[PDB]
Amino acid sequence: DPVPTGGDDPHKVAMLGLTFDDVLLLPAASDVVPATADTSSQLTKKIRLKVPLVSSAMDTVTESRMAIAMARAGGMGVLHRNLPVAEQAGQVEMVKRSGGLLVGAAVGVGGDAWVRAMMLVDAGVDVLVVDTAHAHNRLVLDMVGKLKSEVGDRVEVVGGNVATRSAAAALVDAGADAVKVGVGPGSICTTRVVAGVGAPQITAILEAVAACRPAGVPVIADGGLQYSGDIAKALAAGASTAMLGSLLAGTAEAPGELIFVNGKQYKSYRGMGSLGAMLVPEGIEGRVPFRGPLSSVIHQLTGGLRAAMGYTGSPTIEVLQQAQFVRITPAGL
Amino acid sequence: DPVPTGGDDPHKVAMLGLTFDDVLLLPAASDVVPATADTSSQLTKKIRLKVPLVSSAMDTVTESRMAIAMARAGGMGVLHRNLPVAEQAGQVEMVKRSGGLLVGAAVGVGGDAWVRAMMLVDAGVDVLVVDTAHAHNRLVLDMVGKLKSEVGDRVEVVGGNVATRSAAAALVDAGADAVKVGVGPGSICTTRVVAGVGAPQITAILEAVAACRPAGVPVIADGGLQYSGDIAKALAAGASTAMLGSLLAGTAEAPGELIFVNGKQYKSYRGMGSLGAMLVPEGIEGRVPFRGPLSSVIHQLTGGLRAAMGYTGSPTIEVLQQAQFVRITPAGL
Amino acid sequence: DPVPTGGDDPHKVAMLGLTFDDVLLLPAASDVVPATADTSSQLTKKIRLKVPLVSSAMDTVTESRMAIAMARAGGMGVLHRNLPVAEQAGQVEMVKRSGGLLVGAAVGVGGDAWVRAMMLVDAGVDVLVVDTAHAHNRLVLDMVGKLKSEVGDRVEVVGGNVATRSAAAALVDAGADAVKVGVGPGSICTTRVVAGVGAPQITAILEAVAACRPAGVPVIADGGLQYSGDIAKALAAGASTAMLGSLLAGTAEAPGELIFVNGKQYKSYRGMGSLGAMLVPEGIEGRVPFRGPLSSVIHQLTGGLRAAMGYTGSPTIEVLQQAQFVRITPAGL
Amino acid sequence: DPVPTGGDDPHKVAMLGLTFDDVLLLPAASDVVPATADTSSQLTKKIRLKVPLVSSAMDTVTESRMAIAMARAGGMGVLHRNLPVAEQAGQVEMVKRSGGLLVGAAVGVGGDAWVRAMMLVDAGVDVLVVDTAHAHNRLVLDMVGKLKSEVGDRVEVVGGNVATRSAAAALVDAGADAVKVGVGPGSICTTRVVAGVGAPQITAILEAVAACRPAGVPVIADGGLQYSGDIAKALAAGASTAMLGSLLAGTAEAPGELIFVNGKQYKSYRGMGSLGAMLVPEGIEGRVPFRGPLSSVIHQLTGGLRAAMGYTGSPTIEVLQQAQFVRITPAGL
Ligand SMILES: NC(=O)c1ccc[n+]([C@@H]2O[C@H](COP(=O)([O-])OP(=O)(O)OC[C@H]3O[C@@H](n4cnc5c(N)ncnc54)[C@H](O)[C@@H]3O)[C@@H](O)[C@H]2O)c1
Ligand SMILES: NC(=O)c1ccc[n+]([C@@H]2O[C@H](COP(=O)([O-])OP(=O)(O)OC[C@H]3O[C@@H](n4cnc5c(N)ncnc54)[C@H](O)[C@@H]3O)[C@@H](O)[C@H]2O)c1
Ligand SMILES: NC(=O)c1ccc[n+]([C@@H]2O[C@H](COP(=O)([O-])OP(=O)(O)OC[C@H]3O[C@@H](n4cnc5c(N)ncnc54)[C@H](O)[C@@H]3O)[C@@H](O)[C@H]2O)c1
Ligand SMILES: NC(=O)c1ccc[n+]([C@@H]2O[C@H](COP(=O)([O-])OP(=O)(O)OC[C@H]3O[C@@H](n4cnc5c(N)ncnc54)[C@H](O)[C@@H]3O)[C@@H](O)[C@H]2O)c1
Ligand SMILES: O=c1[nH]c(=O)c2[nH+]cn([C@@H]3O[C@H](COP(=O)(O)O)[C@@H](O)[C@H]3O)c2[nH]1
Ligand SMILES: O=c1[nH]c(=O)c2[nH+]cn([C@@H]3O[C@H](COP(=O)(O)O)[C@@H](O)[C@H]3O)c2[nH]1
Ligand SMILES: O=c1[nH]c(=O)c2[nH+]cn([C@@H]3O[C@H](COP(=O)(O)O)[C@@H](O)[C@H]3O)c2[nH]1
Ligand SMILES: O=c1[nH]c(=O)c2[nH+]cn([C@@H]3O[C@H](COP(=O)(O)O)[C@@H](O)[C@H]3O)c2[nH]1
């Protein structure tokens, strides 16, 4: 008898992938109210954040202003790599000189990326993010391993992005201090349309965590978070932090100017694989509603997270990571 | 082999949650026609209603005018608690002086809520509703138990809201005279977006009833009812009454004035967790179509319920609670 | 362990109901081309149609003009019962005098319905349709049995509507010469919203056929057919004929006049349970695009059916009833 | 106990059919970057293409200009058969005289189709495509066998279209040099609405490949490809090439003129079963956005395919055919 969806191979369709909108967190017994919840969580093996949020390494999201504001809000920014090495290293220094704030910076793969990494380390960066669409490529695993052996106890090395248990395991073996998850889910991502490739993000987190948690390696959920409720869902699936692009792109601190249209305000937001950022693009150029100061956006996001922690009876993010989901049907939206 | 939706824990995604739109009632053998159906049902252990409908404890739904009209229609109102204690107690007296009509009133948790409760009991209220977003919080279970031990044979004590079997069981153990179900489903609810928390309402009722029915405790289905057909579905899932917000907010008797727009009439309707009602809000402020007199709305809702009773062969609500569902696909809408 | 959708009763959600849009017919080996297919099929035990289509007993679909045109096209009309007995009987005579054409007529339940039935039989009707929303009501089963024992070898007696195997079996036992299926699916039906009751139509046909086929009783699929492809699907699920309302309401022969709007033409179409037709209505009043002559509409519908017969390798409707489905996902629409 | 979807036959609903939008390709371990991927693949047993793309045999897609451009781009065109034999044969000669480019041409079934085929072979065509809606009809299998025995080592003979394992197996037995898959999926196809017949295309490919691959016969995925990502999905499901209609209809090289509307440009695109092309039509007449030169469209499509190959670690199309899918939910779109 055939597999009900076709052919005779039961592993051809390997999984059923759930995204954020497919699940809700179940309320549970609680002695936690939103006010008493503790939102701190590991970004990497060595680095703990007060607020488990990181801004995306995108040229419409994180330059020094955003990185400073994120660190002051208890999270962290990852400086984007679409600018000369000297300028990126300069922005690292601008952040570190603003009171010894934490900061990360993105690098790619290869010789130029190596020079960039060494300059960032010299400028005092806390976290290097090897920042790629496909960390299961051998070249990315090599870059992560080479960085960790060279500068590994002066700096934390994050590898990404992955969407499977096997890819997460490979980054763990290469020595990553955190594993970043997300292939396909970004709001400005067209990888699913252009390449037909991706993994729904709740399932991707569940799978990456199955490799990373037994190894003591934190998982960063990256892409597709549209609402504060999604942050609670990502962390409950086992992520330790979430990386945000679109939710932060509309803020005052994000690079780019205010666009006034029809009495409404917008800001430019674009994929780092868009034509404008870079050809077969895998990102789009768009705009998002203007959201005002970063500090207030983060307060709303953390407020939603704290509500989820109270509903699930989670005093800490570590307990939130043990919460359960109910799956919902299309009618549920 | 992994769980097909991710990870190695088969209980991480604990349930598949159905909402009202996911199911239909199956017609069955019948010697009932809508005219002969008996719609009476227990609100609490001690209180039976002629019509199994309760109006929401919301400041755009139930003040004394709505409570009087609901009781005269054979149901009951629950007076909202967004007003001073003296005024809420006054409205209880206004209802009781209108012919010994049944009335309930909402209270929260804590010292002020206690003073409020004692005043309501003194004013002659029939039902206290401990009225919270999360009754599985230890503080709410304590409030329910404290009220029941103190004023428990003078007044009925309802606890809510819950969305799981374990939460319902906890309220039963605390001594609730009814258990109110609904976390996430309200029309003006943004808990699912803000906190990422909720449970689809048919599954939530089925689970709460699995704890409550063996204990002889009635379940009140609260939130997400959009159509008269949903009332029949909630009761068939095992609820004994339904609580209505949006379906009653448009009525003449609801608080608030008529809004004339484009020759159409509306009334304000808002969550009790909205900014206007209260910060990270979990409700919105909106409007609903004006619906005319409450009496006529209730006649239409009970007419739909009676039709369902005839189709399912249910002469009483107790038999309707034994009816079966067919699940439908998205194509079914 | 609970049922995954809630509670501890695996039969509470009894079925997964498929509708027409949930399935496609699988192509199969074929020596049939659309031109050679034979579309004849049993309407009842004793009556075979050349084209397996019947027009709905609705006052915006079938009066004598439609009945004459349907019979001439190789199908049949069922005259509606929203008119005096004398007038309905008169229209039966008008059809029979137009060349001994087949005709049916609807009756309800009770004394007045009985008088109506006797007059229709005297006027020479071929088929009485006991025409109700819920044939599993004991009163309807009694009417079917009483008619069959009284006038049963002069006239064929159809009973409906049902949506389950048990209801179909009950009509078989009462002596129905055909069983009509459809509770909830009609285009102008609001039973699913008002009463929350219904059964998706492919599953309803599959279940009714499981009772009717072993008893040699034909099944009429009634309601929810939107496209010619749906007729092939209904017959493949095991129905022997299909009854059409909305697909025929726009035709020249349907009662009602042409409505000109924005250079487009419409005709009124309304449920027989609508306010205008009859209170808690379970039908709506609307309009449908004007479609021109009935003869041309039937040619298009039979052409689609013949195409399906060629694709499935079915030379006759009896072989089409053995065809298989593939289920499709929401993405499939 | 009944089948959960109705009746007592577990094979009545035979399969669950997935389409392109139901799945994503899973990233895997990779030493492939888009630049190093090899996109060559078998069109037929004897013919390999550099780019695994074929243009549809439609009179709004492929005449000699499109066929020349497709062959120069490394793919192939199939000349449509809605024109006199002499003219179609002439266009074959026009292509062959443009540098010994590969070309195919469509024929139907019967005596006239035979004369057409012989003229095409004499004009030097490389591939005859027996071009029908239903190749599991005995008449089509006979045409394929007759052509292969008569002209079979001078020319390759493709048979289509099929949507099942059994139909693919029948074409293999008849001697097809490739099997073309797609019943129902075309953008301008109304077979699913008119006849109610079809098979979702990923499942159809998986099933056809289960018959064809063990026989060494290539599968051409035909219809429903909307995005470059769909090409990667079709090939991963086991197809060896993809045939494109709508994605190529907007190009400069496609037959038909530019339609200027609202400052936007369009081109006519119509099914070959549409009224205009040919009655009960199973295709529609429409328009598609103007896309510019074919060469640039093919570069974008191959770029998406190469990205998918890098993500899946596939250096060749043969390895891409071993990639795995994750199924997504409706929420996933
Ligand atoms: N999402 C919501 O906030 C929500 C949901 C349902 C109803 N309401 C309505 O809003 C009004 C205020 O209700 P409320 O419960 O927000 O009032 P509240 O602030 O008075 O809280 C009362 C008690 O409920 C518990 N609680 C509430 N939310 C919690 C959470 N996220 N985590 C842990 N415990 C929690 C706490 O024990 C708290 O002491 C009421 O009228 C209620 O009917 C709000
Ligand atoms: N939802 C609907 O009301 C509905 C559905 C299908 C067809 N129709 C059409 O509307 C017209 C009136 O049909 P009707 O059946 O409402 O007529 P009706 O009022 O004449 O009822 C006839 C019999 O059907 C049974 N019945 C009908 N609805 C029932 C219910 N909810 N519960 C139990 N028994 C019920 C009763 O035995 C009743 O005596 C007919 O022409 C019919 O074709 C209505
Ligand atoms: N739904 C459609 O009609 C459809 C589907 C795919 C492609 N097309 C395109 O339309 C054009 C005409 O194709 P066609 O196959 O309609 O041409 P056609 O009328 O020339 O038929 C050719 C042969 O296909 C078989 N066939 C076709 N439809 C059938 C059915 N419903 N049942 C049984 N056998 C059937 C018959 O054996 C017939 O002799 C072609 O260019 C084709 O590519 C049409
Ligand atoms: N779909 C996308 O292109 C995508 C996805 C996520 C993030 N981004 C962002 O865009 C920017 C560029 O990222 P990038 O990875 O495209 O940069 P890149 O071109 O610098 O590639 C870096 C390395 O990633 C690997 N890689 C990337 N795409 C691959 C594929 N399709 N197949 C195999 N290996 C592949 C290769 O080893 C490559 O050497 C970054 O800022 C990143 O955050 C792009
Ligand atoms: O497929 C992609 N193409 C792109 O061009 C692109 N640019 C950024 N990113 C990724 O998207 C994340 C931001 O996602 P959100 O806007 O949903 O927060 C980021 O954090 C990245 O992981 C991309 N992904
Ligand atoms: O999540 C929520 N945020 C809020 O601000 C809010 N206010 C009311 N309620 C609840 O909603 C119920 C009314 O729901 P309906 O409008 O769907 O009838 C009510 O009966 C309550 O249970 C809220 N829920
Ligand atoms: O629920 C209902 N309320 C009504 O008022 C009503 N009127 C007709 N019918 C039924 O609908 C069938 C026609 O359906 P279509 O328009 O989909 O063909 C008809 O053939 C009937 O079975 C009704 N059903
Ligand atoms: O059902 C159909 N009715 C038609 O009239 C018709 N014309 C073409 N085709 C088929 O559609 C394919 C093109 O599909 P796309 O536009 O989706 O690429 C083509 O390659 C054909 O397989 C038809 N199918």
Numbering used by the authors:
A (entry chain A), B (entry chain A), C (entry chain A), D (entry chain A): 28 to 127, 253 to 430, 455 to 509
Q: What do the authors report?
A:
IMPDH catalyzes the NAD+-dependent conversion of inosine 5’-monophosphate (IMP) to xanthosine 5’-monophosphate (XMP), the first of the two step biosynthesis of guanosine 5’-monophosphate (GMP). Inosine 5’-monophosphate dehydrogenase (IMPDH) lies at a key intersection of the purine biosynthesis pathway and represents an extremely attractive target since it controls flux of the guanine nucleotide pool. We have overcome this major limitation by designing a variant that lacks the non-catalytic CBS subdomain (MtbIMPDH2ΔCBS), greatly improving solubility without impacting enzyme catalytic properties. Here we present the first crystal structures of MtbIMPDH2ΔCBS, including the apoenzyme, the E•XMP•NAD+ complex, and complexes with IMP and three inhibitors, MAD1, P41, and Q67.
The structure of the tertiary complex of MtbIMPDH2ΔCBS with XMP and NAD+ was obtained by soaking crystals containing the MtbIMPDH2ΔCBS•IMP complex with 200 mM NAD+. The 1.60 Å resolution crystal structure of the product/cofactor complex contains one protein chain per asymmetric unit. Although no potassium was present in the crystallization buffer and this ion is not found in the complex, the high quality electron density maps clearly show that the product XMP is present in the active site. This indicates that the enzyme in the crystal is catalytically competent. As observed for VcIMPDHΔCBS•XMP•NAD+, the NAD+ adenosine moiety binds in the AB-subsite located at the subunit interface and interacts with residues from both monomers. However, the nicotinamide ring flips ~180° and is in a syn-conformation in MtbIMPDH2ΔCBS•XMP•NAD+ (with χN torsion angle of 5.7°). The carboxamide moiety makes direct hydrogen bonds with side chains of T343, E458, and Y487’ (which is a part of the IMSM) and a water-mediated interaction with the O1N atom of the phosphate group and the N7A atom of adenine. As a result of the syn-conformation, the pro-R side of the nicotinamide ring now faces IMP with its C4N carbon aligned with the C2 of the IMP hypoxanthine ring (C4N-C2 distance of 3.28 Å). The deuterium also transferred to the pro-S position of NAD+ in the MtbIMPDH2ΔCBS catalyzed reaction. These observations indicate that the orientation of NAD+ observed in the XMP complex is not competent for hydride transfer and may reflect cofactor conformation stabilized by the IMSM.
